[PDB]
Amino acid sequence: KCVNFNFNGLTGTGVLTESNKKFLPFQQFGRDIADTTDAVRDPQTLEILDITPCSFGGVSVITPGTNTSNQVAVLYQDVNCTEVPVAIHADQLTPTWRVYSTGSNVFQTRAGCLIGAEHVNNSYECDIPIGAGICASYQTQSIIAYTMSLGAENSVAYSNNSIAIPTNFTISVTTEILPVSM
């Protein structure tokens, strides 16, 4: 349980669990590579307990232009689909809790958990990049998430005695813009 603790003045916050650390009999608490308290020994029962900070992460909001619509999609970065906040009962510091946060369209990606967008089996050009090959777009009156398509399929009719030669041509004009000064 995500609770505070006080071990002889060792104040902190986190989740206490069982530890497999081979603590020596004279040892009190361990530490990590970052030189922070990782495990502790209970002063009363002499039991070694692991310390892990409560779950956390960044939050990103996916939205089209406000001139277009008002719906949004929320992506919880590097958070498993199960541990996403389901209840807002004084257990999260972000009051922007989703209208359901569950039962709704919920997609789990390699970039985190995406809530508020409907997965589809099609593939279009990338519109809003999400990460790990997943893009999002506003289609129709709704927000959808899909896998980006690299391009149209093609196959040249290769043979060892066949060639192709143009007969017409086109004159094309294109533009290029380069900053020169500030």
């Binding site: 349980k1 995500c2 609770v3 505070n4 603790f5 006080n6 071990f7 002889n8 916050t13 209970d42 002063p43 009363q44 409560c54 779950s55 956390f56 992460g57 960044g58 939050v59 990103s60 909001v61 996916i62 939205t63 089209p64 232009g65 406000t66 001139n67 277009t68 008002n70 949004v72 929320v74 992506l75 919880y76 906040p85 004084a90 257990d91 999260q92 510091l93 972000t94 922007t96 809003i128 990049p129 999400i130 999002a136 506003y138």
Partner: protein, 48 residues
């Protein structure tokens, strides 16, 4: 709501199409516990 948080982050009342990083979430603690040694003898400050 998250859209208003985005507007607060951008310091504007209009938001262009895109993905924006607003803030971070964490699970708030439920209760607090205290673990202390089981000894009860009182220190001899009266003598000193």
């Amino acid at each position: 709501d998250p859209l208003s948080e985005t507007k607060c982050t951008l310091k504007s009342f209009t938001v262009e199409k895109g993905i924006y990083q607003t803030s971070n979430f964490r699970v708030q603690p439920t209760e607090s516990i205290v673990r202390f040694p089981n000894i009860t003898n009182l220190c001899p400050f009266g003598e000193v």
